[PDB]
Every structure is written in structure tokens, then in C-alpha cells.
């Protein structure tokens, strides 16, 4: 747990404190999934399989994981109620915000798309 020490009395106590033999975080942190796992991951990511260097992704992920998996050994130590009137009030006060583009037809919702068919977005089979 967290702890506050005694107040420093002078700058040399601070210099000695800073020179104590204590691990750096670098020192504390000590600065592979199957190819099928990686393929599943590329799919979930909506990334192409073609051209993907599998073993390289396997290798990078392996190191990423061993870094975050350090958590495995760390033990865990240990809101306003919306009421009825506020419920009803919120409902009564909801309205369409022009700054949100919430008014129908207030902006061309398809006008940013690279491709479209009239007022429809399009996806190619």
C-alpha cells in the first residue's frame, strides 16, 4: 500500500534518498501464439491475410504478451440514482441538436462517401 514518509529536513537528505539502492521500474519490468491464432486475429481485425508476415506477427505478439502477462502474478488488493421525476424530466427535455446533425435531412449523410448509389451507401459482394 501507499505510504508517506517523514518530511525532508534538507537537500542532502534528498540526495541520499535519491541514491538509495532501490530497483528502477526498468529493472522491475526487466526491460508464441499459433499461426492459426494469428490468422484468426487478422480476421477479427478486418486485416488481409495475403501478404501478411505470419511469423513476424507471431514474434511481435509473443513479446507484447509476455510484457502484459506480468499482470498474471500481481494480486488485486481488496453514481447518482436516476429517479422517477428526473426520468420523466429528461424525456421531456430531449430535443434534436443541429450541432449533432440530428434534424432529418439537415446534412447530406452520404456526401462523405467515396462511392454511393443515389442516397444509399454501397458494399460490393
Amino acid at each position: 500500500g501507499a505510504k508517506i514518509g517523514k518530511k525532508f529536513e534538507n537537500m542532502n537528505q534528498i540526495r541520499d534518498y535519491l541514491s538509495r539502492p532501490v530497483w528502477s521500474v526498468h529493472e522491475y519490468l526487466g526491460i508464441p501464439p499459433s499461426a492459426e491464432a494469428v490468422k484468426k486475429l487478422l480476421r477479427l481485425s478486418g486485416l488481409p491475410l495475403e501478404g501478411a508476415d505470419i511469423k513476424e506477427i507471431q514474434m511481435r505478439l509473443a513479446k507484447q504478451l509476455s510484457f502484459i502477462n506480468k499482470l498474471h502474478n500481481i494480486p488485486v488488493e481488496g453514481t447518482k440514482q436516476l429517479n422517477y421525476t428526473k426520468l420523466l424530466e429528461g424525456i421531456s427535455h430531449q430535443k434534436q441538436d443541429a450541432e449533432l446533425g440530428e434534424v432529418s435531412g439537415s446534412w447530406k449523410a452520404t456526401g462523405l462517401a467515396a462511392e454511393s448509389k443515389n442516397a444509399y451507401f454501397v458494399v460490393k459482394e
Partner: protein
């Protein structure tokens, strides 16, 4: 002067790759102030690219709330600044426009600016703008500010609106402000420190008032230095500069204490569990169907929908997306992700236990024998070369992750934290950190010792 200003702008832009887009007519309560905006914050008048092929000519129909508030305060926006693509990186090297170069050195040196708000910091260090807006998810305002020898403030989470601030990791993302002038920075913060009902995470008016009501006279001020952050290999010059600053403070009559906050040590593994997961989630929308870049020929390949378009994600972005999806799959979620959330709660609780100021989000009472501020290094490293940074990262992700060792705990706990320089034009900094919501204390303290 005007001619001299434009010429300066063209020169530094050409040599340092700072902006992704610039006002056609540059320099033509914040009335007359000039700002740059990180290019992951949407604007009506400029493309918002996120330094990504994915959004290379994206034009938002609307201004981010922070952009609107600035405009309403009379701020002129000089342009959008280059960044690490979608906010992912700590060095400022991942961008479709090429890396940003640190203007503290000759551009031939190819020194890193730091990231992800690289261009933001550079535009301030060059005196191109009065202030810049950036975003800070794990250090991305404080670290580049540090490397540009300017002020970099990351306010408490939820103070400044994230409406129109493109999502990276929403539980961590914070809009931040960079400037050489503490006075300008405070004015900007005051302008932007506002409730926004468009943002479901915006700190409520009620909680803001509760925070104000909790403020007390503090005499003397009590400042902690953190044991766990007091033993890293630091840059040459740091100890002298650090010890001079602490001595200045001690001679002002404030009290300095050692404090141990053990949870700060596990913050990087916590961060790289939670943040990539959110990133993968928040980047799931990018498909070129409704906006942004779209593959000219295919919406699907190898039985994977949107793959051709999404292949244009930067390489670092793909790596993180892949990791995040791993972290979210069922078995890993029940293990690492849940554990990371619980440890994050522990961290917030540990900070609450050592701060005198109450945390209104956790309803902590405040520790009357606790502290008002922490002072912590911003970075343990000097800016290296872009090549060296790129070489080191290629060796291991951990080598890059460690760059945020000092900044991530305040991101995870949403604490207001300001990096301030210790010496003119020197890429070394300290953070002043307060309890959640205690932004005015951090800023007034920094103003007082400036």
C-alpha cells in the same frame, strides 16, 4: 514582421514537417491568439487525417467542441499538426507525412520530437503559435512538450470535451494544451474547462461545483516525490537541474516528503492491456463505406470484409489492433483485461489515500495527513535520433513502451499533470501532479514558481 512571420512559418514547416495542413491566409478573451490543432481533433475548415491513409482527405461536417470554444473566444487556427497515426506511438515517427523533427536541434540531426502530439509541441517550440491543442492518452501531450522544452498540461479526465476528438482509448483520452506561457495556458484551460452534453463522459456541472466547494487554504503546501520513480537512469544534467528546483521550492517554505505508491510500477502492463483493446474497438468503424479512404476495387478479400481498405492502416496501428483483439477474446478477457481494470482501481485508490483533496468520482474523503502535489520526472531519456528510435522499437515493443513509464499512471488515474521545462531549450522536464479535479492548484503552483 508579418512577412517575417510567414517566412518563418514556411521555413520551419519545410525543415521540420510540423503541420499536415495550414491556413491559406496565415496570421491574417483569447482575441488575436494563434493556435495549432492536433490532426485528430475534427475541424470544419481543414481535413482531419489522423496522420493516416485511412482518413487522408477526410473533411468533418463539424468542429470539435474545443475548436468551437476557441473560435468563439476569438482564436485564429493556424493549421492542423502532424502526429503519430491515430495517436499510437511515443516518438512522433509514425505518420503518412513522415516524422516530425525536433526544432530544438538542426533538422539535419533528425532528433525525435516525441509523440503522439509531435507537431503540436514543435509548433510551440518554434514560436509558430501562441498555444497548441494536443491529446494525451498515455503521455502524448506531456512527453512531446518535455522534448520541446515547453509547458504541456494534461487536465483531469473529463474536464475538456472529447466531442469531435477522434477516439483512441476513450477511458484514457484527454485533450491537453501546450504553450511557452503559463498565462496563456491558464486562459486556454479556463475557456475549455466546460461541461458539454454532447460528450457522455464530460464532467457534470454538479461535480465541478463539488470540486470547487472542496478547495481549502493549504499552509504550508505539501509536495511528494515518489519513491518508485526516484531510481531510473536519468539524462546527464537531470540531477543538477532537479535538485536545483527542489531546493528552490524548499527555500520557499513548502514541505517536501518521500512517498511510496507501489501501484505505479505495474502501470505499463496495465495500460498496454486496456488501451490496445479500446483502440481495436474504436477503430472498428473504419471501412471506407461512409467516409475516408476506400479501396477502388474491393470491399472484401480472403473472406474478410473491408480488408483491402483497412490494409492502409499504418503498421504500428495494425500491431496494436491485433494485440487489442487478442486482449478482448473470451479467455484473455476474463484474465488479463479484468485484472488490469481491478489494478487500475487499486491505483486510483492508492492515489486517493495520499492526497488531501477528496476524489469526487470515488467519494474518497481525502487524507488530512496527505499531500497536495507530486513532482515526478516527465521522461528518463533525452530525445534520440529518428533512426535510433526506429531501430530500438524494432528490437522490442517494451523498449518503446517504457518511454511512458512516468506519464501513464496519471493517465490511468485521470490526474491533472503539467510537464514544465527546467532549463531554457532543454528537453528535460518535471510533472506537477494533483488529485483528480485539482487542476487550478497545479496551474497556480506552476504560475507561482515561474
Amino acid at each position: 514582421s508579418l512577412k517575417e512571420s510567414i517566412e518563418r512559418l514556411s521555413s520551419f514547416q519545410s525543415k521540420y514537417n510540423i503541420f499536415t495542413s495550414i491556413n491559406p491566409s496565415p496570421y491574417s478573451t483569447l482575441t488575436g491568439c494563434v493556435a495549432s490543432i492536433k490532426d485528430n481533433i475534427v475541424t470544419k475548415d481543414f481535413p482531419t487525417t489522423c496522420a493516416s491513409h485511412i482518413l487522408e482527405n477526410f473533411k468533418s461536417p463539424f468542429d470539435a467542441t474545443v475548436v468551437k470554444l476557441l473560435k468563439q473566444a476569438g482564436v485564429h487556427i493556424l493549421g492542423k499538426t502532424n502526429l503519430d497515426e491515430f495517436g499510437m506511438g511515443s516518438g512522433g515517427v509514425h505518420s503518412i507525412r513522415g516524422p516530425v523533427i525536433n526544432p530544438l536541434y538542426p533538422h539535419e540531426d533528425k532528433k525525435i520530437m516525441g509523440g503522439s502530439s509531435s507537431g503540436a509541441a514543435a509548433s510551440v517550440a518554434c514560436d509558430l503559435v501562441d498555444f497548441a491543442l494536443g491529446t494525451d492518452t498515455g503521455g502524448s501531450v506531456r512527453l512531446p512538450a518535455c522534448y520541446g522544452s515547453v509547458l504541456g498540461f494534461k487536465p483531469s479526465y473529463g474536464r475538456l470535451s472529447r466531442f469531435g476528438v477522434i477516439a483512441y482509448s476513450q477511458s484514457l483520452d484527454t485533450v491537453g494544451i501546450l504553450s511557452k506561457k503559463i498565462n496563456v495556458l491558464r486562459k486556454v484551460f479556463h475557456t475549455l474547462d466546460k461541461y458539454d452534453m454532447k460528450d457522455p463522459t464530460s464532467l457534470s456541472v454538479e461535480l465541478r461545483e463539488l470540486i470547487e466547494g472542496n478547495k481549502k487554504v493549504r499552509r504550508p503546501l505539501k509536495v511528494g516525490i515518489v519513491k518508485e520513480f526516484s531510481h531510473e537512469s536519468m539524462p546527464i544534467g537531470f540531477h543538477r537541474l532537479y535538485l536545483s528546483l527542489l531546493e528552490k521550492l524548499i527555500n520557499l517554505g513548502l514541505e517536501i516528503y518521500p512517498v511510496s505508491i507501489p501501484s505505479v510500477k505495474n502501470c505499463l502492463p496495465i495500460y498496454y492491456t486496456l488501451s490496445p483493446a479500446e483502440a481495436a474497438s474504436n477503430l472498428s468503424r473504419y471501412d471506407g463505406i461512409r467516409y475516408g479512404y476506400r479501396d477502388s476495387e474491393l470491399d472484401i478479400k480472403d473472406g474478410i470484409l473491408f480488408a483491402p481498405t483497412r490494409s492502409k492502416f499504418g503498421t504500428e496501428v495494425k500491431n496494436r489492433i491485433i494485440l487489442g483483439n487478442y486482449n478482448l477474446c473470451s479467455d484473455a478477457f476474463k484474465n488479463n483485461f479484468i485484472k488490469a481494470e481491478k489494478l487500475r482501481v487499486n491505483l486510483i485508490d492508492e492515489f486517493d489515500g495520499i492526497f488531501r483533496f477528496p476524489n469526487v468520482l470515488t467519494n474518497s474523503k481525502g487524507n488530512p495527513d496527505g499531500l497536495d502535489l507530486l513532482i515526478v520526472p516527465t521522461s528518463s531519456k533525452l530525445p534520440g535520433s529518428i533512426r535510433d528510435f526506429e531501430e530500438e522499437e524494432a528490437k522490442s515493443p517494451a523498449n518503446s513502451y517504457i518511454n511512458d513509464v512516468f506519464t501513464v499512471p496519471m493517465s490511468l488515474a485521470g490526474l491533472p499533470s503539467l510537464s514544465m521545462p527546467l532549463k531554457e531549450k532543454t528537453p528535460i522536464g518535471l510533472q506537477v501532479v494533483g488529485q483528480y479535479g485539482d487542476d487550478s492548484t497545479v496551474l497556480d503552483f506552476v504560475e507561482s514558481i515561474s
